[PDB]
């Protein structure tokens, strides 16, 4: 830094800087040192150990799991109900039936129109981009084509379902660092928000946010495209924006360091030994360990008297005492009688008078 003439006539420690005489630990330098110790013990290598008994004596066991004639000879020889609506709906139609269709939401983005030339005139076909994804931990974008706008929408949604991808979202609904995203001119910067404040984004795109499962975030689009249309480039920005997110459980596993939040205390790292301390003990073998273990001589626990708790109904609030004021006793008596009623208290009446 600042290699001026004045600095060059003062930083020189010596007239000659003998770099070849420097002492740096190299690979060959250490190899020679070990060899010098051996008086006139050299490098050796070992080959892989190939044992036939590793698989010969184990492959037979796996055969017993399929030796049955009914599982070996064979080889080597459309609607779903929707009870609150009650109407037939196509089940498969190229869609996984296992996945519940009554738990997802769709959001129409745009309906673009294209033109096609032929020998006679012009042919127009519509298109749409529909994003389908659960609003908890799922997101997806699909694209397709169709002859009419109504048909295009349905076809576009189909691809979104089949291309559903998981996200890395924090349990606590709190991101770590703000992510940034790009494809050509675009920039989509997601600014996190404090817990308990809610979402803040464009009203047009509001539904989109919800669909993503992201809470407490400020999603803003900084010029999705500066040329042509702005719908196509934008499609790929989402994909390469949420992949960069990281949760606590991810960083802690590799970081092997304190990665706790502020409100909870040591929730993911604290692992009490539940298989060493609460180990079972029977009365038949307890007498043998009394004469072998250290005698109990300590004082550090007062609340050390508990056993199997049996559910029991109690009413601590309604408990007359010799120190309660006369008014309190009266007030509690009337209140207790009201809750114990099973004819008037546990009933719902619409009109006030007994009509």
């Amino acid at each position: 830094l600042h290699n001026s003439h004045q600095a060059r006539v003062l930083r020189r420690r010596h007239v000659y800087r003998d770099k070849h005489l420097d002492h740096v630990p190299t690979e060959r330098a250490r190899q020679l040192a070990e060899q010098r110790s051996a008086f006139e013990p050299h490098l050796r290598v070992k080959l892989e150990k190939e044992k036939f008994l590793r698989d010969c004596m184990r492959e037979q066991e796996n055969l017993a799991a399929l030796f049955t004639e009914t599982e070996k000879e064979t080889l080597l020889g459309q609607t779903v109900y929707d009870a609150e609506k009650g109407m037939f709906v196509r089940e498969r139609e190229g869609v996984d039936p296992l996945i519940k269709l009554h738990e997802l939401r769709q959001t129409l983005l745009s309906v673009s129109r294209m033109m096609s030339m032929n020998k006679q005139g012009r042919v127009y076909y519509f298109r749409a981009i529909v994003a389908v994804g659960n609003g908890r931990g799922l997101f997806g974008i699909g694209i397709a084509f169709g002859p009419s706008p109504k048909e295009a929408r349905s076809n576009a949604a189909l691809a979104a379902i089949q291309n559903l991808d998981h996200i890395d979202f924090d349990v606590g609904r709190t991101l770590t660092t703000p992510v940034h995203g790009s494809e050509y001119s675009a920039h989509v910067k997601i600014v996190p928000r404090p817990l308990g404040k809610g979402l803040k984004s464009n009203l047009r795109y509001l539904p989109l946010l919800y669909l993503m499962g992201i809470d407490n975030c400020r999603v803003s689009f900084y010029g999705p495209s500066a040329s042509a249309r702005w719908f196509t480039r934008a499609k790929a920005l989402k994909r390469a924006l949420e992949q960069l997110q990281s949760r606590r459980t991810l960083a802690n596993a590799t970081g092997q360091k304190y990665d706790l939040l502020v409100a909870p205390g040591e929730h993911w790292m604290h692992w009490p030994d539940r298989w060493f301390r609460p180990i079972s003990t029977e009365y038949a073998r307890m007498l043998e360990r009394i004469k072998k273990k250290r005698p109990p001589s300590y004082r550090r626990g007062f609340r050390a008297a508990i056993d199997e708790v049996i559910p029991e109904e109690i009413r601590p609030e309604f408990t007359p005492y010799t120190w309660k004021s006369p008014l309190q006793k009266w007030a509690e008596e009337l209140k207790r009688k009201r809750l114990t009623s099973h004819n008037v208290y546990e009933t719902e009446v619409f009109l006030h008078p007994p009509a």
Binding site: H2, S4, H5, Q6, V9, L10
Partner: protein, 103 residues
């Protein structure tokens, strides 16, 4: 001129310290020692830019005075200011010489 908020940044404070010396002293190398009891000391200063956050360098050639005429061309020396004007060009006084060039 620097604003009030510009006097607390680390970039400006660091540059200030380098420029600032006891008794407003300066460091430079002599480039002309032709006239009797006269030597021109070339001092290098620094400045900070609040726009691009980068510091540059600019030379400042000044005239000095020597009693014993011990300093010679190409020898880094130390100068001290004075509260007067002596001679047509003389504006500084020598204290000591750090480095000496062979002959």
């Amino acid at each position: 001129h620097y604003k009030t908020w510009q006097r607390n940044t680390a970039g400006y404070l660091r540059t200030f310290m380098r420029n600032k010396l006891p008794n407003n002293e300066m460091i430079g190398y002599v480039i002309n020692d032709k006239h009797p009891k006269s030597i021109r000391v070339a001092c290098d200063r620094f400045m900070y830019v609040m726009r691009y956050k980068k510091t540059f360098r600019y030379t400042k050639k000044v005239w000095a005075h020597d009693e014993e005429s011990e300093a010679r061309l190409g020898d880094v020396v130390r100068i001290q200011p004075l509260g007067y004007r002596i001679g047509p060009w003389k504006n500084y006084v020598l204290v000591r010489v750090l480095h000496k060039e062979p002959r």
